[PDB]
Amino acid sequence: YSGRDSLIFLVDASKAMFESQSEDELTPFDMSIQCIQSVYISKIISSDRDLLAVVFYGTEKDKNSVNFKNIYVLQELDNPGAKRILELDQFKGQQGQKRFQDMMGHGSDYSLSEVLWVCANLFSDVQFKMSHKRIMLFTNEDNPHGNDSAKASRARTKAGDLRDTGIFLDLMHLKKPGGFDISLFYRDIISSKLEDLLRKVRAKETRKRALSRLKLKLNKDIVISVGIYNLVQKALKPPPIKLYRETNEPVKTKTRTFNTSTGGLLLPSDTKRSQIYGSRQIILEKEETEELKRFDDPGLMLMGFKPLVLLKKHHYLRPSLFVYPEESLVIGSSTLFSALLIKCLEKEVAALCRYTPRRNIPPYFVALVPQEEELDDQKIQVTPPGFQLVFLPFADDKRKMPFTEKIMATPEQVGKMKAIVEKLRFTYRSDSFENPVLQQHFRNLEALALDLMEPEQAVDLTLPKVEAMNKRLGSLVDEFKELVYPPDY
Amino acid sequence: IHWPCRLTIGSNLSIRIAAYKSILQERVKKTWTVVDAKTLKKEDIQKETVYCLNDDDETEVLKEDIIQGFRYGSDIVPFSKVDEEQMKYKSEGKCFSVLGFCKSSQVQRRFFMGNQVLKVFAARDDEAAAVALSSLIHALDDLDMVAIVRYAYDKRANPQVGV
Amino acid sequence: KISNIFEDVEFCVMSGTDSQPKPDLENRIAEFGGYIVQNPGPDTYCVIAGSENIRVKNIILSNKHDVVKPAWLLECFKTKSFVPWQPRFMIHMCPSTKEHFAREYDC
DNA sequence: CATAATAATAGTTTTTAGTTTATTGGG
DNA sequence: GCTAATAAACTAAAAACTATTATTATGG
C-alpha cells in the first residue's frame, strides 16, 4: 500500500501578519516561516513520499492556475527540495519580510472561498494516489467575517464541499495563544501544536508495508495464512551515490569479470565456484551452491510446544519479530489465531517451530512467545497480540569461555552498592535516545545543502553526563568506596 | 579477544573489565573463490568495475574523480571522504558507562535487537575488581534492576546504547 | 574568448554567489575561457571563494588549493587581463603559493 | 477458421546476505 | 621477536505493493 500525504500552508498577508501583535518580538510572519521551514526539514529527513505547497491569500500581483484575485501561489504540490528551502528562507526575518513587501506587498482582501477553490485545484493537480490530505491555516483573525455574509456563506458551502471530498483544514490561535479566544466563527464546522511543529523532530522513517506473508503449517494438511511484521530495524545512513567531480553527474557503474590471459570477457555461466581443502581444489557450480543453501520450502512447520522456561536472557540471536494472521488466501485463519492468542494464560508453554523466512535458505528453529493485547485506557493498542519470533541458537553458536570460578563476596559491599544504585535511579524510557551518528549525519546534510555558515550540533541524550548523576547520588559513591588498593594503576 | 575497558560510573567508579564473544552467528571463513571452468585458475579472473558517464559513447571516468553523493530530498548533495569524515564525530576510546538503572519490568524482550551476547568477566589478576563485580552482580540480583550502558567497542566503532 | 590565456586552466567555481549570482561569474569566466568545475582537483589552479561555508572550511582545512576572494577575480575582469597576486584576497593557500608570496613578499 | 470483447501475465521498490577495510595477534 | 578473526563496507541484495499490456474461455 502506497500513498502520498499532503499538507498545504495558508497564511494571511494583508495587514495583521507583519505586526508586533501586543508584543515586542518578531511579527507572526517570521516564526510562521520558521515553523514551516522546520516542518520542511522534518519531512525531508522523515520521508520523500509526500508533497507540500505554500499559498498566500491577500495578493497584489496574482499568480495561480485559475488567476483569481488576492490569490498567490508560491510553491505547488511537490516533494520538498533544497531549492524550496532556499526560496522559503529568502523571506525569513525582517529582511525577508521587507523583501516580501518589495516583491509582493501587503493589504489585499481575503477571499476564503477562492482559497478553498485554489487548494482543491492543487489537489486535483497531482496525479499520485492521495493517501491523506490536510490543510493548516494560521492567522491572527479569530473571525474575519465582518464583511458581507455572502462570502461567509460561500466559504461555509465550500468547506462542506471539501469535507465531502475528504479535505480537512486546521486553524489555531496566533494572535492570543491560550484562552480559547480563537475560532469564534470557525468553531462551527471546523475541528497547542505550535511547539510540536516547532520541535521539528526528525531522523525518523515511516513504515510503508509489511513483508513475508507465510503459512503456519501445523501438519502436512492444515495451514494458516500469516504475515511476519517487523517492529525494529537497525537504521543506517542512505548509501552514498557515486558522482562525477566536475559535473556532479550520476555514474553508470559497470562491474564485470575479465581475463588478462586473452583480454576477453567471461559470462556468469562459465565461471565456476572453487574451494580449497586438504590436497584437492574442490570445484562447485553456482546453481549447486544455491541448491546447497536450499533446504525446503518457506513455511512454519509446527514442531511442538515448549514451556516458557527454556528461553534464557543469555541465549539470544537476531531480533525477534511479530506475527499476525493474514486472511487473503486462507480464510478462518484470523478467528483460529485469535482463539489461540486469547488462550495464553493457560498457554504459557511456548510454541516451538522451525522458521524458513524465504526460499532456498536453511531453516532456524524459532520459538513463539504469545504476545498480549496491551490495550491502553486511551484506546491505544501497543504491541497487539501475536507471537514473538525468538531465534534459538545452534550448538555451534556458543563460544567457549574460560572456566575461572569466583566465590560469593561480602554482603556489606553488596548492600552499599544496593543503596548506591537505588539512590541513582534512572526512569528508563524506550523512546528516549537517538543514534548520535545518524542524527549528526542528518545535521550535516541539512547544513551542507543550504547556504548555512556552520552546522548545528544537536545535543544527544546518549552522551553520559559528568556530574549530574554524581550529584543525584552525592559523594557517597566515593565515601562508600572502601575497596582496598583500587585497580587503578 | 579480550576487551579490557574501564567500567565508569559517575566520576570515581572505575572497574577494569574484559568482554568476550559468547553467543554469535558462526560464519564460515572459507568462501567459494571464482575460477575459470576450463582452467580452474583464479589468476585469469579479473574482477573490476568500470565507471562511465551518462554519455552517448559512455565515456569512461577514473576512480580519483568519484565523489560521494546522497539523495537529500529532491536533490543530491556531494560529499568527499575526507569531508564526510571530518563532519562526522563519535565518542573516543572504549566507551562503557552506565547511564543509570531501572526496573526490569520496564524492559521487555519485544524490544531486543543485535546479535551479540557479550559476556563480561572481571580483570586479570585483580581480585579487588573481581570481588567488586561479584558484589555488584549480587546487588543487582537483590534489587532486580537493569543496567543501561552506552557501549562503544572502540573509538572507531559507532556508539551503541544498550542494556 | 576574452583571454585565451585563462584557457587550459581549471578554476574551481564552487561558490560564485558572494555578491553577484554564480551563473554570471561562470559565464564571464567562460568568456575568459577558464574551465568551470564545482569541486577541487589537482589540475585546478585556484578555488573561487564566494560565500563562506562549511565546504569553504573544508577547503581551508584541506591544504590542497587556494581560497581566493572574488576581489582578485573582480580586478581581473575589470582590467580584462590577469591581475598580480596581492596577499589580501587569500584565506588558505598551498605551500607552493606560500613560497611564491615569500619570494615576492617579505612577510 | 473473423472481432464492441477479455483477463493472468508481466513491471517499480522496500529491506538481509552475501564480501573489504582495518587492528590485537609468534617459531 | 613479519602475519591480527577484527565487523566502518564489503556488493549488489529472490521484495510487493500499485500501476499497465498480451490472451482469450466468447458475440460471430
UniProtKB/Swiss-Prot annotation, chain A:
Compartments in which it is found: Nucleus; Chromosome; Cytoplasm
Cross-link entry Glycyl lysine isopeptide (Lys-Gly) (interchain with G-Cter in SUMO2), positions: 242, 272
Family: Belongs to the ku70 family.
Subunit organization: Forms a heterodimer with XRCC5/Ku80; heterodimerization stabilizes XRCC5 protein. Component of the core long-range non-homologous end joining (NHEJ) complex (also named DNA-PK complex) composed of PRKDC, LIG4, XRCC4, XRCC6/Ku70, XRCC5/Ku86 and NHEJ1/XLF. Additional component of the NHEJ complex includes PAXX. Following autophosphorylation, PRKDC dissociates from DNA, leading to formation of the short-range NHEJ complex, composed of LIG4, XRCC4, XRCC6/Ku70, XRCC5/Ku86 and NHEJ1/XLF. (Microbial infection) Interacts with human T-cell leukemia virus 1/HTLV-1 protein HBZ.
Gene: XRCC6
Residues bearing PTM Phosphothreonine: 410
Residue list for modification N6-acetyllysine: 272, 286, 293, 416
Name assigned to this protein: X-ray repair cross-complementing protein 6
Region (Interaction with XRCC5): 328-437
Domain Ku: 216-423
Keywords: Acetylation, Activator, ADP-ribosylation, ATP-binding, Chromosome, Cytoplasm, DNA damage, DNA recombination, DNA repair, DNA-binding, Helicase, Host-virus interaction, Hydrolase, Immunity, Innate immunity, Isopeptide bond, Lyase, Methylation, Multifunctional enzyme, Nucleotide-binding, Nucleus, Phosphoprotein, Systemic lupus erythematosus, Transcription, Transcription regulation, Ubl conjugation
Other information: Individuals with systemic lupus erythematosus (SLE) and related disorders produce extremely large amounts of autoantibodies to XRCC5 and XRCC6. Existence of a major autoantigenic epitope or epitopes on the C-terminal 190 amino acids of XRCC6 containing the leucine repeat. The majority of autoantibodies to XRCC6 in most sera from patients with SLE seem to be reactive with this region.
A Gene Ontology term for the protein's cellular component: DNA-dependent protein kinase-DNA ligase 4 complex
Enzyme Commission number(s) of this protein: 3.6.4.-, 4.2.99.-
Annotated region (DNA-binding), positions in chain: 232-296
Stated consequence of mutating residue 129 to A: Abolishes adduct formation
Keyword Hydrolase: yes
Effect listed in the UniProt record for changing residue 133 to A: Abolishes adduct formation
Native organism: Homo sapiens (Human)
Curated annotation (Swiss-Prot), chain B:
Inducing or repressing factors: In osteoblasts, by FGF2.
Residue spans crossing the bilayer: none
N6-acetyllysine PTM positions: 21, 88
Highest taxon in the source lineage: Eukaryota
Compartments, record wording: Nucleus; Nucleus, Nucleolus; Chromosome
Domain Ku: 9-163
Location (main, coarse): nucleus
Keywords noted in UniProt: Acetylation, Activator, ADP-ribosylation, ATP-binding, Chromosome, DNA damage, DNA recombination, DNA repair, DNA-binding, Helicase, Host-virus interaction, Hydrolase, Immunity, Innate immunity, Isopeptide bond, Nucleotide-binding, Nucleus, Phosphoprotein, Ribosome biogenesis, Systemic lupus erythematosus, Transcription, Transcription regulation, Ubl conjugation
GO cellular component, one term: DNA-dependent protein kinase-DNA ligase 4 complex
GO biological process entries: activation of innate immune response; cellular response to gamma radiation; cellular response to leukemia inhibitory factor; DNA damage response; DNA recombination; double-strand break repair; double-strand break repair via nonhomologous end joining; hematopoietic stem cell differentiation
Entry annotated with the keyword Nucleotide-binding: yes
Reported modifications of this chain: ADP-ribosylated by PARP3. Phosphorylated on serine residues. Phosphorylation by PRKDC may enhance helicase activity.
Record remark: domains: The EEXXXDDL motif is required for the interaction with catalytic subunit PRKDC and its recruitment to sites of DNA damage. The VWFA domain interacts with the KBM (Ku-binding motif) found in a number of DNA repair proteins.
Any further remark recorded for this protein: Individuals with systemic lupus erythematosus (SLE) and related disorders produce extremely large amounts of autoantibodies to XRCC6 and XRCC5.
Family listed: Belongs to the ku80 family.
Protein's name in the database: X-ray repair cross-complementing protein 5
Designated gene of the protein: XRCC5
Swiss-Prot record, chain C:
Disulfide bond annotation, renumbered to this chain: none
Disorder this protein is connected to according to its UniProt record: LIG4 syndrome: Characterized by immunodeficiency and developmental and growth delay. Patients display unusual facial features, microcephaly, growth and/or developmental delay, pancytopenia, and various skin abnormalities.
Protein name: DNA ligase 4
Occurrences of domain BRCT (ranges): 1-90
Highest taxon in the source lineage: Eukaryota
Subcellular location: Nucleus
Self-association state and partner proteins as the record states: Interacts with XRCC4; the LIG4-XRCC4 subcomplex has a 1:2 stoichiometry and XRCC4 is required for LIG4 stability. Component of the core long-range non-homologous end joining (NHEJ) complex (also named DNA-PK complex) composed of PRKDC, LIG4, XRCC4, XRCC6/Ku70, XRCC5/Ku86 and NHEJ1/XLF. Additional component of the NHEJ complex includes PAXX. Following autophosphorylation, PRKDC dissociates from DNA, leading to formation of the short-range NHEJ complex, composed of LIG4, XRCC4, XRCC6/Ku70, XRCC5/Ku86 and NHEJ1/XLF. Interacts with DCLRE1C; the interaction is direct. Interacts with APLF.
Tissues showing expression: Testis, thymus, prostate and heart.
Functional description taken from the UniProt entry: DNA ligase involved in DNA non-homologous end joining (NHEJ); required for double-strand break (DSB) repair and V(D)J recombination. Catalyzes the NHEJ ligation step of the broken DNA during DSB repair by resealing the DNA breaks after the gap filling is completed. Joins single-strand breaks in a double-stranded polydeoxynucleotide in an ATP-dependent reaction. LIG4 is mechanistically flexible: it can ligate nicks as well as compatible DNA overhangs alone, while in the presence of XRCC4, it can ligate ends with 2-nucleotides (nt) microhomology and 1-nt gaps.
UniProt organism field: Homo sapiens (Human)
Family the UniProt entry places it in: Belongs to the ATP-dependent DNA ligase family.
